[PDB]
Scaffold this active site. Structure first.
Site, PDB file in Angstrom:
ATOM      1  CE  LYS A  41      -4.031  -1.602  -0.544  1.00  0.00           C
ATOM      2  NZ  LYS A  41      -3.927  -2.751   0.339  1.00  0.00           N
ATOM      3  CB  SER A 271      -3.737 -10.962   2.296  1.00  0.00           C
ATOM      4  OG  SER A 271      -2.493 -10.312   2.189  1.00  0.00           O
TER       5      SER A 271
END
Lengths: 310, 310
Positions: A41, A271
Site C-alpha cells: 500500500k 492475505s
C-alpha cells in the site's frame, strides 16, 4: 542513488522461488512486505499523493482526510509525514490499539468514531470532515482513485517483467482495491504485449467477484483474510483483464501463511497465505506445470502477530 | 531476477535524505529495516550460514545452535528455515513472549533458560548443547565470526559507495557486534581507496569503546538502546578503522527515533535514533557542512512497539 524522502523508496521488491509450493519451481513470490510501511500500500499512498500534487488538488497547506481499513492509512501516514502534509484519518473504536498508536506516532490526527455500524461511520465522517471545508481537505479514495492502479502499471508490473526477463506466464493476486492485479495485468498484457493469465483471489466466505462473473446473487460475508474481500466490486478492479478467479478459505490462508514462515523463511500476512494457496492449486495442474507463476505477497508478518496469525 | 530462497534477498537497502536533520542535506540514512527479518542482521544470518557451508562445518543434516540477544536469532531462524536447517536457539525467561512466538513460528527449537544470571546462562547452555555432541551442532558466534563483517564488506559497503557514486565522506554506525562499521569501513577505505571518516556510536551509559581508546577504566552499564552497547569490545570491532566515537544517551535515541517517524516518515528502532543523533551532531559542525554523511539505520520500528518506543 539517494531518495529525496521515504515516499520515493517504494518498490523494487524481490522475487523469491518457493521450495515447498508449486511443481519443480513454477511458483515464485513477489514480497511486497519488503517496503516502507511493510506492505504494497506504500505504492498507492505514495502515488495517490504525488498525483494529487501533479493535478493541483494537493497544495502546500491542504490536509489529507481519509478513512482506512488498515495498511493504506499507514502508507498515507508515512508519505504525508515524509512529504510534510497534515493528515486526518478516520477509524471507529473497532481498532487495534497498536494500530492507533502507530498512526498517532506517525503524526496522524486520528478520528475515533463509534464502532456499531462499522466502517461506514468513519468513512461518512471522512466525507463529513471534508464537507465542513472542501477547500481545506482532499480525500484520496483508494478504491476508485486511478493513481492506485497506475502505480502498479508503472512499477510493480515492470518489476515483474524485468526480474523474470518476460517469462512470467501467470500472475496471482488477491483483490482488495483491485489496483494491484489491474495495474500489473495492464502492464504485462498491454504494455509488454504478453497474454499472461491473470488470477484474482478472493475469500470463499465473500466470493463476490466469482458470484458476479457467473451471474449469481452476490452474497458478501465475514472472513479473516485481512487485506482482501472488500465485499463488493471495487472501481479499481477491471474485470476485463481478469482471466480466472480463485477462492480460498481463511483457515487455509492462515495455514499457508504460517507454512511460508516455517518452511520458506518468508514472513508474510494472512492475505499472502491466501494468494499462495491459490497459486499452489494452479501450479499443481498439469496445464500449468511448464508456466511461470508469479504471486503477490501483499504484506509482511509482524503486523498481524496479535489477531489470529500468531 | 529470482532468488533461490529468502536468504539471497538480503541487502540493496535504500539511501534516503533527511529533511529535519543535518545541514542543507548532508545527512542521508541507509534503511536496514528494509530487509528480510526487518534488520541488518539478516545479512550476517545469511552469510554466517553460507560460509559455514563453504567450509564444510555446516552439512546437510547438522543443527544450528546459538544464543541470541534478539535480531540475530530471527535472522538465523529465517535463513535456517529458508535453507532447511534445524536450529536451536537459547534464551532465558527474560524474553519477549512475542519474540518467543516469532522464533517458534520460525521452526526454532527454542531453549528456555533461567533469567537470573541473564544471557550468560543461555549462552553457556548454547555451548552446553554443543558440548553434548559437537558433531551434531555448529555455533556461529556472531561477535567473532568474520563472515559477519565480510558480508558488510561485500554488500553493505559497496551499496553505499555505489548509491553515492563514491561521494560518501563520513559513515555513522552504532556498534553491537561491530561487523557493520568494520565491513563498511574496510570496503570504502581499503577496497574503494577513500579515506572517509568512520564514526562508531555507543551509549553514554556504557561507553566502553570510548573509555578504552582513552585508557580510562572500562565501566559498562545498563541502557535502553536496543541493539548496541554490548558492554565490552567485540572481536568483530576493528578499532583500526574507527576514526571517531560518538556517545548518545537512551532518551535522545528514543526522541530521535520517534522524530524520524513523525517528521521523516521513517519507521526505525531506538538504535537508529541513536545513530542519527550522533550523525546530526557532526553534520551541524562547520567542518562537516560540505561532507556527505551516511548513517546506518540498523532495524525497523514495528519490532519495538511494546517496550518503550511506543
Amino acid at each position: 542513488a539517494i531518495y529525496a524522502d521515504n515516499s520515493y523508496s517504494i518498490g523494487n521488491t524481490p522475487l523469491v522461488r518457493l521450495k515447498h509450493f508449486g511443481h519443480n519451481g513454477n511458483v515464485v513470490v513477489k514480497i511486497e512486505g519488503r517496503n516502507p510501511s511493510y506492505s504494497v500500500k506504500c505504492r498507492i499512498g505514495a502515488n495517490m499523493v504525488w498525483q494529487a500534487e501533479k493535478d493541483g488538488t494537493l497544495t502546500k497547506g491542504k490536509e489529507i482526510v481519509d478513512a482506512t481499513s488498515g495498511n493504506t492509512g499507514i502508507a498515507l501516514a508515512y508519505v504525508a509525514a515524509a512529504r510534510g502534509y497534515k493528515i486526518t484519518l478516520t477509524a471507529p473504536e473497532t481498532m487495534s490499539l497498536e494500530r492507533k498508536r502507530l498512526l498517532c506516532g506517525l503524526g496522524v490526527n486520528l478520528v475515533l468514531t463509534e464502532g456499531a455500524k462499522g466502517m461506514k461511520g468513519a468513512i461518512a465522517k471522512a466525507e463529513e470532515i471534508v464537507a465542513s471545508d472542501p477547500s481545506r481537505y482532499v480525500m484520496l479514495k483508494q478504491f476508485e482513485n486511478p493513481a492506485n492502479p497506475q502505480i502498479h502499471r508503472e512499477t510493480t508490473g515492470p518489476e515483474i517483467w524485468k526480474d523474470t526477463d518476460g517469462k512470467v506466464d501467470v500472475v496471482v493476486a488477491g483483490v482488495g482495491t483491485g489496483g494491484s492485479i489491474t495495474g500489473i495485468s495492464r502492464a504485462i498484457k498491454l504494455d509488454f504485449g504478453k497474454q499472461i493469465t491473470s488470477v484474482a483471489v478472493e475469500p470463499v466466505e465473500s466470493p463476490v467477484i466469482s458470484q458476479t462473473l457467473a451471474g449469481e446473487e452476490v452474497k458478501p460475508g465475514p472472513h479473516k483474510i485481512q487485506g482482501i474481500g472488500a465485499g463488493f466490486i471495487p472501481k479499481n478492479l477491471d474485470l476485463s483483464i481478469i482471466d480466472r478467479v480463485e477462492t480460498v478459505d481463511s483457515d487455509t490462508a492462515l495455514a499457508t501463511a504460517r507454512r511460508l514462515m516455517a518452511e520458506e523463511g518468508i514472513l508474510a500476512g494472512i492475505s499472502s497465505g491466501a494468494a499462495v494457496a491459490a497459486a499452489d492449486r494452479l501450479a499443481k495442474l498439469p496445464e500449468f506445470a511448464d508456466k511461470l507463476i508469479v504471486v503477490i505477497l501483499p504484506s509482511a508478518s509482524e503486523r498481524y502477530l496479535s489477531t489470529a496469525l500468531f
